[PDB]
Structures are given as structure tokens and as C-alpha cells.
């Protein structure tokens, strides 16, 4: 009641760490794996605790950039639902008891040759684990490995075996690819080598005044994605007709294939693809998606070889996946051995087989046949609950290990903290099965990596983020024409198809407990906390019997606003439950309207419906894995939609999918941009004012900002792909709270940056998608500052917009005057207070907001203050009184996360800075300029490079 503040005790160390300065965060080089392939990350430890993850500039596949999963691994480690103890049968047990039971069980196996012993891991690329598994197989000859995961690359290795007769790894160097063609290949999505491909593609799309060339992207996909956004031409073909499309493409170029009866639009698309190809030989690449059948991969290799792209844009290396194999076939063989009762012991290392296996395999029922089941899941997953001897697994941020990225690099997974709840790694278990219990994970990876690179090599590897000796050698395989020519090449049919796609934020369902990813609005859909059956408007009209024409969305420029109003009226059918019958299964999942979807195709997103997940996501979405089948894991044949009425509430962060004829998004052509980079701005202003220049006049003086630092930001629309990595980075850096689905339904999501798609163009059933990131524009004449009565929002000496939490009384007037609506309010108590692990995840340099205050983008002021203090201290310690900040000294979290490099931050006044050079371009513009706000965050208009045969 008195004394203003309590006692606040302070507990220091008893022995100081040798290399740590208290109050100074440090950085460590580790590796994060997505689908078994590694990604070098630079992770920040504040006082021995991981808090932020950023890119490792020294590591390929992460040249200073990360994906949303690498950013969200921070909160995934701090989940309060992670496993803490060993469970024999749900009973808390010990590690020594499990070791004795494993040794006794393996003694019985020693009487045989391990015939009953079976393994079950995911896509393994770690050399240490692969060497220990091989040693265990030499000790037990009749044992089998059997690796499987729901998001695998079985079609890639199958196509490589069909074409070259051996296992090869295909790498794409997009930096020298003027024409790129994607056959249902979502290479701009989180996958193998996603950051490197997205960076090279973006740097080829960043056009300037002196620029002279620009690459072109062709994509053919069933459901639109991030790759289709950055495409100059997009063809919404069905998922089954893409194999026949590839055959027709190979046939048109004069190479062995098969002609196919296709639509006139697909015929004109084949024409243009073939014409732009053959004119860019060695400057082109054809990419086949992992979802497409093996024949599509083989035909793509053949097309690339004939065009001369091999050795220039397509490179072949030795396999980097340890054992490359058809994982679904090995899973069928394992469940067959389980049904026959041959297996006696089944050891699983992650992957959640009970939830991830296809529905027609009945993994849970056959799992009872094997008496001893053992699992390491890092959570109490569904499989561990139905298994004996559950062993908690150590998080990648608290364990020793290694991994291999695409093209092979063999980076080290360096821990940052002792395991919180204990928990062993995979190689520790493999050493336990090798008669070596109580083996330290440090000594295991250190013993394997020694005697190969040396002690000085291990020290250099820990210092940097890579190992310089390990890289996949370049090989030259031979192509088999007869095998790839004599292939059935399946044709579409059987009616409405189902396309199984990984969820953009949840992947295989591992991150269903992560609040940051579950709340992240999905790209192109903007849904949160839920799962839906995505279908085009025409498909929903025809199949669910909805009373709309779907032809009124077609029109010209004269009736564009009327078509947008009809699309608004049509969006009212979102939420209708549909009883999809695929192959003996009814799913009963609500529907959602995605305009770009191909007709007669429904996209179902994986990773929902879990029952033994954490408190977050414990019962979200409808499980699609039961209807998933082993014969076709990505495509479907025939389905029965069966509309049931019985609406379900779906929640979206935008609720309006069309810009109502305003100057929000600017698009141009490269041929006209070359002659004059300012032509887009000269347009609009003529149609709005009759002149080529808007003579905006203001009544306020503002401030000068001449000899001082002026912080500014530039967003390049030609590089944004909607990967939503900047949003998770902003959440992880600025302690942004996580509200429930109920609070998002009422429009109370808290996000300092948001990406908006606007589905614009003719037809509105085949629309171009425009993604645009929006944060605080930092208006020099900010209207949000002239309305807050307590002066809680003012302006900074450097032109920044100061939003002070402890002064806001919460009038909510600062938001109504914000033209861009980039201010979020704590209507209730949103920040977590009780959970200790979430309190450990908070960034100590940012205050955690309480109920009744406002938030908005602060240009990551903690990093600006740190660099300014460091610059002043370096200036006075040398006796200069200069105080000068380098260009790359400050990097906001959204700038570092972006794998494409679309966000550039720096000093406006320093003319040699990258931002000053970018803002001087002809296509640099600021949103809502008619309001004299003078924003410091500007946009670079999107420039397109379309073909003349398709446009004319």
C-alpha cells in the first residue's frame, strides 16, 4: 500500500561465467531443421537463455534470413506443455529403469539378429546419427531402419531413379535463370533451400534506373500459394492434369512426350512457355514440385538437359539425405510387419506416427501388436500416450547435435542452455542401444566429428556456423531416355479432386501448440486458429448449390466496382460445413472461398485436429489425415461435397478482399519502366487531378531533419512473397501478446506489421494477388500525435514516432486518427503473467504491455538505442565527439527475417545509404499521400515482365 515499490530482491551468481559481461547479450551459431534439412541460425542468448533467432550470413540456405518456423522455435521451446519426465505407461519413471529395460530387451534380440527390433525416424541427415544407426545395424543384422515423415520428398528421389538410374540431389541457381517455370512447385515456400532460392529470385527481380534485365516466372498450380503471387503469369490448372501438362510441354519442345487434350487457355500457356524457352537456353530452369508424380520430375530433368540448362542453372550433387528412399512404401512395409505380428520391439524417434500416418494404414490399431513401443517426441504426443517408455526429447536449442542443409554443409547444432526438464537426444538413445548408457551428447558428436576434421576444425566450426570440409560433390549422371519415355503418364478425371497441402503456419502439425504460428494469419486466406476447405467461388456455387451466378464476377473496367460488391456479397457463404466423402471417410469441414483455386478442386490443409497437443491448439481444425491415403498422398480422385447447412464460425483478419479503386497498390510493366521509371506515378495523378504532379500543400511547418539522423524504411513490392516471416520476427522481438480466437473474432488481434492481399483484376475468379506489408509509416506530420491529450505519442529528434506505454491513459483516439490503422490496443489483459516459461521467453529490452495501453511499430527502437549508445561511446572513447552510425549497424527484426530482402532500413539523410538510394528511384511512393503525413516508410511500385504472346 505504501513505499511506492516493493523490496525487489536481486540474486547474482556464485561463480561468474568466464566470457559473459552481465547485461550484454551474446550470439551463438546453431542449426534448425525443418523437414530433416538444416538451416544455420544466429540465436541470441541474453543471460544464458535463447530469446531471438536470426539468419546466419555465413551459412548457405540462410544468408541472413530465416523462415517463420525458425522464428517460432523460440516459443516452441518455451512451451509449458513440453514433456518433463519419462513415462513407462503414463506413469512417471526414471532413466535408469528404462536403460535396464532396454538392455534386457536387446539381450533377447541378441539371441536373434534383431529381427524383432525396428526403428522409425524421420528424414535423417545428421552424419552422427546416421553413423550410429549404421553401427547398430551392423551389430543387429536383421534390424530395419524405416524412416518416414508426412512431408517428404519421395517423388523427387523416385523421379531421379527413373531418369538417371541413381540417387541425385538437384540444386537450382536462380541467379542465372532469366526464365523459370514451376510445375506445381512451391519453391518460394518454407522447404529445402527456401531462403537461398527466394533471395536469388528477389535480387533478380529488384529493378532500378540502371537496370536492364528482369526474370520471368511461369507457375502452374492447383491451389494458389506464395510462389503464384510473384508470378508474372499464373495458370490455375487441376492437380491431376499437371502430369499431362508436363508431357505436352516436353512434346512441344521437340522432345519425347505425349500430346494431351487441354483447354485453349492451357494451350496458349504451353505456347508462351515453349516460346520463351528455346530462346533462353542455359538461362532457364523447369522446376517440378514434390507433390507431382515421379514422371513429372523425370520429364523436367529431360527438358532441362535438352535445353542446355544443366551445369548452368540445374546442378546435380551426391545425395545429402543419408539413406534416400520411398518413405511411404517403407511405412506400408512396417505396418504390414506389425499386422503380421513379426515385430517385437518398435523404437520411434519423433515424427508422431499415430497422427501423421495415412488413415488407410491403421497405425494405432497395429501399434498394439508390438509389445514394446518407445518414443521420443519433445511433447506427450498422441503416439507417446499409446506407447510405453516415453522419453522426453531435448529441444534443438538445448542439445548437442549436427545436421545437413541442402547441397550438404554439415553444420553443428550448438546448445544455449542445459535441458530445462532434462531429456535426451537421438544419438544418446542410439548410444544406449549400442551398449553405451549414460553417454553425454557432447562427447558423442565431438567423438564423431573429431578424427575427421580435427580439434582445430571443431573449434572453427563452433566459431562460425558451417563446416568448410563437408559439401556434396558435383557429379554428372547419365539420362535414360527409354525409361522416361515408356511411362503411362496418368490423365485427370474421376470428378472433384482433393489436394492435400501443408498448412502455411503449422506444417505437419508439430507447431500446433505454438501460439505465434496458430495466430499468424495464413497467406491468401487470412484465417487464424482454424482449418477450412479452400475452393474457388465457381466450385462452391456448383457443388454446394449456393444461389449465385458466379459469372457476374466477370467483367471489364467499366463495372469493376460492381463486381467487387458482388464478391463481397458472395463472401457471405464462408463457413458452410461440407461433408467431403473421399475414400470411405467423411470429414465435415467448413468451406472457405479462395478465388485463384482451380475449378473442381478442393484444398485441405494438414496439421489440424490433434487431441494430445498443448493447451494451445488442443482441439482446433478438422483432421485431414484420416481421409489421406497411401496410394496418393497429395492428390485426390473423386469426392462428394454434400452441403449440410449448419454453419461454423470462421475468423479472418481482413474480411475485405478487394481494394475499392484506390491508390493502395501500384503495378507497372518492365518494358515501359525501362524508358521511364516514373510512369506509374505520372498515371493515377492524371486521372485524379489532370496533371502529372500532385501539388500537395500543407499548413504545418514540421521539423527540419537536415544535419541529424533520419530513420526510414523501404518495402519493395517486387520482392515480397507473403512468407509472414516478418510478423513472427516482430512478435518474437517486441513481446507482442497472443490473444484467443474469440478476441480475434471481435477484431482485436495485436500485430505491429500485417500483410494484405487484395485479389484484383478482371474475372475475380482468376485474380492477380497483391501482397503488401503495412506497419507504422512514421509520419513526419503524424496525425496520431495531435490528438492524444496526455502527450503519450510524440515525435523524436531522429524523426521517429515515440509511443510511450506508461503515459497512455487509453483514450483510443490515437487510433481513430491513424489513416493506416496500425495501432493496436490492449482492450483486456493479454500478456501472460502466470506461465513461467512464457515469462522466460520475453525480450528484456522491451516492456511488456499491460491492459489499457496502445502499441504500434517502433522501428525496433531497442536496436536503434543500442547502436546510438555504442556509437556515442566509441566516439568519446577515441576523443572525436563525432557520433557517426554505420549503414548496416541497425537492422530491424522484420529486415533480418525477410529471406527476399524486401525490407531496407537506414538513414534517410546519409545519401550513400541503401535506403537513400532506394528512395531516389522513380517508382518510390508513400501510401495515402493526399493526407499530408509525409511517411518515412515508403513502397517501391511493383513492376511486371509479361510476355508479348500472352498479353497481345
Amino acid at each position: 500500500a505504501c513505499t511506492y515499490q516493493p523490496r525487489q530482491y536481486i540474486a547474482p551468481f556464485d561463480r561468474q561465467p568466464e566470457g559473459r559481461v552481465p547485461g550484454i547479450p551474446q550470439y551463438f551459431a546453431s542449426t534448425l531443421t525443418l523437414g530433416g534439412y538444416g538451416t544455420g541460425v544466429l540465436v541470441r542468448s541474453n543471460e544464458g537463455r535463447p530469446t531471438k533467432v536470426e539468419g546466419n550470413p555465413r551459412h548457405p540456405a540462410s544468408l541472413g534470413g530465416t523462415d517463420l518456423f525458425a522464428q517460432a522455435e523460440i516459443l516452441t521451446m518455451y512451451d509449458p506443455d513440453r514433456s518433463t519426465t519419462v513415462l513407462r505407461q503414463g506413469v512417471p519413471s526414471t532413466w535408469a529403469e528404462f536403460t535396464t529395460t532396454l538392455g534386457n530387451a536387446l539381450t533377447a534380440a541378441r539371441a536373434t539378429q534383431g529381427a524383432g527390433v525396428r526403428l522409425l525416424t524421420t528424414t535423417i541427415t545428421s552424419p552422427s546419427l546416421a553413423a550410429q544407426i549404421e553401427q547398430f545395424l551392423q551389430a543387429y543384422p536383421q534390424a530395419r531402419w524405416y524412416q518416414y515423415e508426412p512431408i517428404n520428398r519421395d517423388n523427387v528421389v523416385a523421379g531421379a531413379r527413373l531418369a538417371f538410374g541413381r540417387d541425385v540431389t538437384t540444386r537450382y541457381d536462380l541467379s542465372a535463370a532469366q526464365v523459370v517455370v514451376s510445375l506445381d512447385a512451391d519453391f518460394l515456400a518454407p522447404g529445402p533451400g527456401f531462403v537461398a532460392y527466394a533471395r536469388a529470385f528477389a535480387e533478380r527481380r529488384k529493378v532500378r534506373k540502371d537496370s536492364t534485365t528482369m526474370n520471368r516466372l511461369y507457375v502452374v498450380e492447383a491451389s494458389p500459394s506464395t510462389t503464384g503471387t510473384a508470378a508474372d503469369h499464373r495458370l490455375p490448372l487441376r492437380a491431376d492434369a499437371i502430369a499431362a501438362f508436363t508431357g505436352a510441354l516436353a512434346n512441344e519442345l521437340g522432345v519425347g512426350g505425349a500430346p494431351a487434350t487441354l483447354s485453349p487457355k492451357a494451350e496458349e500457356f504451353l505456347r508462351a512457355i515453349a516460346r520463351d524457352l528455346e530462346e533462353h537456353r542455359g538461362q532457364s530452369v523447369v522446376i517440378a514440385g514434390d507433390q507431382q508424380p515421379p514422371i513429372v520430375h523425370a520429364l523436367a530433368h529431360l527438358i532441362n538437359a535438352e535445353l542446355g540448362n544443366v551445369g548452368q542453372t540445374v546442378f546435380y550433387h551426391e545425395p545429402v539425405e543419408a539413406r534416400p528412399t520411398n518413405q511411404t512404401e517403407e511405412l506400408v512395409a512396417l505396418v504390414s510387419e506389425m499386422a503380421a505380428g513379426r515385430v517385437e520391439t518398435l523404437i520411434m524417434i519423433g515424427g508422431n506416427p499415430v497422427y501423421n500416418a495415412p488413415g488407410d494404414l491403421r497405425f494405432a490399431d497395429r501399434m498394439a501388436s508390438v509389445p514394446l513401443t518407445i518414443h521420443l517426441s519433445q511433447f506427450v504426443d498422441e503416439t507417446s500416450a499409446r506407447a510405453t517408455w516415453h522419453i522426453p526429447q531435448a529441444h534443438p536449442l538445448e542439445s548437442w547435435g549436427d545436421a545437413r542443409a541442402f547441397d550438404g554443409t554439415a553444420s553443428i547444432v550448438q546448445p544455449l542452455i542445459e535441458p530445462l526438464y532434462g531429456g535426451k537426444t537421438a544419438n544418446e538413445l542410439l548410444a544406449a542401444m549400442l551398449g553405451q548408457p549414460e553417454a553425454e551428447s557432447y562427447d558423442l558428436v565431438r567423438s564423431f566429428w573429431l578424427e575427421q576434421i580435427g580439434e582445430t576444425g571443431w573449434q572453427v566450426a563452433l566459431a562460425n556456423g558451417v563446416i568448410a570440409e563437408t559439401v556434396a560433390p558435383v557429379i554428372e549422371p547419365t539420362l535414360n531416355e527409354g525409361a522416361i519415355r515408356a511411362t503411362p503418364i496418368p490423365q485427370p478425371g474421376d470428378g472433384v479432386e482433393i489436394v492435400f497441402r501443408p498448412d502455411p503456419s503449422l506444417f505437419d502439425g508439430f507447431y500446433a501448440n505454438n501460439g505465434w504460428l496458430q495466430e499468424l494469419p495464413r497467406p491468401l486466406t487470412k484465417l487464424v486458429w482454424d482449418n477450412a476447405a479452400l475452393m474457388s467461388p465457381r466450385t462452391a456455387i456448383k457443388l454446394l448449390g449456393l444461389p449465385f451466378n458466379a459469372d457476374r464476377l466477370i467483367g471489364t473496367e467499366a463495372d469493376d466496382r460492381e463486381r467487387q460488391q458482388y464478391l463481397e456479397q458472395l463472401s457471405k457463404v464462408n463457413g458452410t460445413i461440407a461433408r467431403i466423402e473421399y475414400r470411405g471417410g467423411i470429414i465435415e469441414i467448413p468451406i472457405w472461398l479462395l478465388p485463384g483455386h482451380a475449378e473442381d478442386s478442393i484444398t485441405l490443409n494438414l496439421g489440424y485436429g490433434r487431441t494430445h497437443a498443448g493447451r494451445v491448439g488442443n482441439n482446433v481444425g478438422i483432421d485431414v489425415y484420416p481421409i489421406r491415403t497411401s496410394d496418393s498422398p497429395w492428390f485426390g480422385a473423386g469426392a462428394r461435397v454434400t452441403n449440410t447447412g449448419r454453419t461454423y464460425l470462421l475468423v479472418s483478419t481482413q474480411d475485405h478482399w478487394t481494394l475499392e479503386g484506390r491508390d493502395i497498390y501500384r503495378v507497372g510493366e518492365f518494358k515501359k519502366f525501362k524508358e521511364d521509371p516514373k510512369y506509374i506515378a505520372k498515371e493515377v495523378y492524371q486521372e485524379e487531378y489532370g496533371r502529372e504532379t500532385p501539388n500537395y500543400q500543407s499548413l504545418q511547418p514540421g521539423d527540419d531533419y537536415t544535419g541529424r539522423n533520419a530513420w526510414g524504411m523501404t518495402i519493395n513490392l517486387n520482392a515480397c512473397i507473403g512468407c509472414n516471416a516478418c510478423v513472427v520476427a516482430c512478435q518474437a522481438e517486441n513481446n507482442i501478446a497472443v490473444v484467443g480466437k474469440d478476441q480475434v473474432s471481435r477484431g482485436r488481434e495485436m500485430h505491429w506489421i500485417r500483410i494484405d492481399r487484395y485479389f484484383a483484376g478482371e474475372d475475380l475468379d482468376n485474380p492477380s494477388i497483391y501482397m503488401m506489408p503495412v506497419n507504422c509509416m512514421q509520419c513526419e506530420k503524424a496525425p496520431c500525435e495531435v490528438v492524444c491529450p496526455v502527450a503519450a505519442t510524440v515525435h523524436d529528434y531522429e524523426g521517429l514516432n515515440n509511443m510511450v506505454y506508461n503515459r497512455c491513459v487509453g483514450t483510443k483516439y490515437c487510433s481513430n486518427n491513424c489513416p493506416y490503422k496500425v495501432r493496436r490496443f490492449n482492450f483486456l489483459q493479454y500478456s501472460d503473467t502466470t506461465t513461467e516459461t512464457f515469462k522466460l521467453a520475453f525480450n528484456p529490452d522491451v516492456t511488456v504491455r499491460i491492459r489499457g495501453v496502445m502499441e504500434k511499430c517502433t522501428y525496433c527502437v531497442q536496436r536503434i538505442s543500442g547502436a546510438r549508445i555504442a556509437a556515442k561511446r566509441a566516439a568519446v572513447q577515441a576523443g572525436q565527439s563525432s557520433y557517426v552510425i554505420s549503414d548496416g549497424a541497425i537492422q530491424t527484426a522484420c529486415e533480418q527475417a525477410c529471406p527476399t530482402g524486401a525490407i531496407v532500413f537506414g538513414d534517410i539523410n546519409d545519401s550513400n545509404s541503401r535506403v537513400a538510394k532506394w528512395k531516389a528511384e522513380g517508382h518510390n511512393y508513400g501510401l495515402l499521400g493526399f493526407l499530408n503525413t509525409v511517411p518515412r516508410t515508403t513502397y517501391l511500385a511493383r513492376v511486371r515482365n509479361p510476355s508479348e504472346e500472352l498479353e497481345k
Binding site: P694, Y696, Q697, S698, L699, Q700, P783, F930, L931
Partner: protein, 103 residues
């Protein structure tokens, strides 16, 4: 709106016109006070007009003066604080090339 505001079709004000009525009311009130002082001895005022009507008209002139100032300041502060570029050129020209001294 038609005679005066249409001179610059790029600008419009909703309070305008009501400002004209208060302006015309102040002008005709001062005109009435002048003409009353002129004809104060017409043998009709002398027998039927006292100081009460003169005091009431003086109070009306005072009330219409503060009313006109209130309308003009209201229009100014609305356009000034909300720095929208479609309404700023009006007060730009009236504050430029010496016109500020008139204001």
C-alpha cells in the same frame, strides 16, 4: 455556394454560407444603427422610441460580432488541425503575399 464558393471548384466548406449569413447579419445591423442615428429626429421616433431598442440593437451587434468570429475560427481550426491537402490551399492563399496582414 454558387456565386463565391464556385470560384475555386477544388475547395468546399460546409460551414460556408452560414458564415455569409452571419456576415450579412452583422452588416445590416451596423447599417440599421447608422440609419437610426441619421433619422433619430423624424417626429415618429421622438414620440415612440426610447433607449431600450437602441440598447437591444447594440447587444445584437455585439452578439453577431462574436458569432461571426466563432464561425470563422471554427472553420479555421477544423481545416488547420486536420491538415488534409484538399482544404489547405484556401488558407494558403489567404496567408501568402501579404494577405496575412489583412487577416
Amino acid at each position: 455556394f454558387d456565386v463565391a464558393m464556385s470560384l475555386d471548384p477544388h475547395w468546399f466548406s460546409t460551414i460556408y454560407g452560414a458564415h455569409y449569413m452571419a456576415n450579412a447579419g452583422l452588416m445590416t445591423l451596423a447599417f440599421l444603427a447608422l440609419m437610426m442615428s441619421r433619422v433619430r429626429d423624424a417626429a415618429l421616433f421622438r414620440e415612440y422610441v426610447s433607449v431600450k431598442p437602441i440598447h437591444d440593437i447594440g447587444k445584437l451587434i455585439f452578439a453577431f460580432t462574436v458569432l461571426w468570429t466563432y464561425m470563422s475560427y471554427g472553420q479555421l481550426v477544423i481545416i488547420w488541425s486536420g491538415d488534409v491537402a484538399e482544404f489547405t490551399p484556401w488558407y494558403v492563399h489567404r496567408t501568402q503575399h501579404g494577405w496575412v496582414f489583412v487577416a
